[PDB]
């Protein structure tokens, strides 16, 4: 039930759903810092495709798509809008 909040101001690129293993409910935001931020494994979306979100905007709720019973948030930072591991940066090191 906790709310995922965008830490950077940017434009929401895509709000879709992938059923199965990875990226249950994922929202991608093109931050003003030049890096793409992805929040996956969500329960519901509060933003819209092509919407400009400021810092502190509410994005959505956390989900349990990976491990039922325990809720978590898949957080990933990229320099591109791809879907692979080629271009991924560790979010903790990046925010440090």
CB 60 within 8 A of CB 40: no
DSSP letter assigned to residue 94: H
Is residue 84 close enough to count as binding its own copies by CB under 8 A? Answer: yes
Q: Residue 38 interacts with Zn ion (CB under 5 A)?
A: no
Among 3, 18, 49, 95, binds its own copies (CB under 8 A): 18
Rounded CA-CA distance 61/48 in Å is 14
Of 2-10, 16-24, 48-56, 63-71, which part binds its own copies (CB under 8 A)? 16-24
Does residue 83 interact with its own copies by CB under 8 A?
Answer: yes
Q: For its own copies, which is the closer residue by CB, 21 or 92?
A: 21
Going through 1-96 in order, the beta strands assigned E by DSSP cover: 3-5, 10-17, 25-31, 36-40, 42-45, 52-53, 58-62, 74-78, 88-89
Binding site for its own copies (CB under 8 A): 18-23, 82-86
């Amino acid at each position: 039930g906790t709310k995922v909040v965008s830490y950077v101001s940017g434009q929401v690129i895509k709000v879709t759903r992938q059923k199965g293993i990875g990226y249950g409910r994922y929202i991608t935001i093109k931050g003003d810092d030049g890096m793409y931020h992805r929040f996956a494994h969500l329960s519901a979306h509060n933003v819209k495709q092509g919407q400009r979100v400021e810092a502190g905007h509410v994005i959505g709720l956390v989900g349990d798509d990976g491990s039922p019973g325990s809720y978590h948030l898949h957080w990933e930072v990229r320099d591109n809008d791809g879907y692979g591991a080629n271009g991924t940066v560790n979010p903790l090191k990046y925010m440090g």
